[PDB]
């Protein structure tokens with residue numbers, strides 16, 4: 001019989017406001033969520049790549065540097081996996097919700113004046129575009145310094161973090177998007193290919209799309 005510890009965190013006030021704004025307003029051009037998550041994996045892959053030329057053993061639990069897109073039409077999930085640097089516990093809590101982001105207020109002002117959600121990345125809050133298409137997001141991550149953790153949120157002002165006792169990943173981050181009922185086009189291979197081609201073609205790392213069938 002298992003016992004697992006969970007910790008519940010409140011999103012920083014403006015992050016929570018941004019989150020509600022994302023979820024509760026209609027926005028065209030939602031497909032940009034994919035560009036934001038892939039840029040995040042590309043950034044984490046640059047990170048491990050550079051860290052390793054200083055200390056090669058950092059590639060022990062993780063040699064290949066790439067991105068995998070995994071739609072699941074049974075689960076209604078869309079998973080973006082990278083073999084990037086990953087996140088420590090502190091990186092998860094601070095980076096994903098707890099600490100104020102300096103661009104937050106500016107972006108909301110931008111949006112309320114009619115800006116395209118596409119501008120989100122320039123404001124340092126690109127991760128949150130995930131909520132344009134997903135009702136719940138799960139982040140599984142593994143950094144060399146630590147154990148694997150699972151971050152999770154359905155918005156509402158809180159997120160949870162717990163040590164993951166699930167499939168081990170070695171090193172990297174996996175963003176699992178539990179898609180809203182009406183956002184299932186993001187599970188289709190043709191559309192995923194369309195949006196990567198439109199928005200994500202200068203990634204310095206190979207991206208593979210895995211289609212169940």
Ligand SMILES: Nc1ncnc2c1ncn2[C@@H]1O[C@H](COP(=O)(O)OP(=O)(O)O)[C@@H](O)[C@H]1O
Nearest residue numbers: 040041044084086095096124125126127128173
């Ligand atoms: N796939 C990932 N791998 C590692 N860290 C990540 C990943 N996705 C997000 N992060 C962390 O979350 C932070 C917030 O991401 P985001 O909201 O996109 O803003 P930005 O990329 O401009 O900093 C990143 O700066 C990074 O530290």
Ligand SMILES: [Mg+2]
Nearest residue numbers: 036040126127
């Ligand atoms: Mg980003």
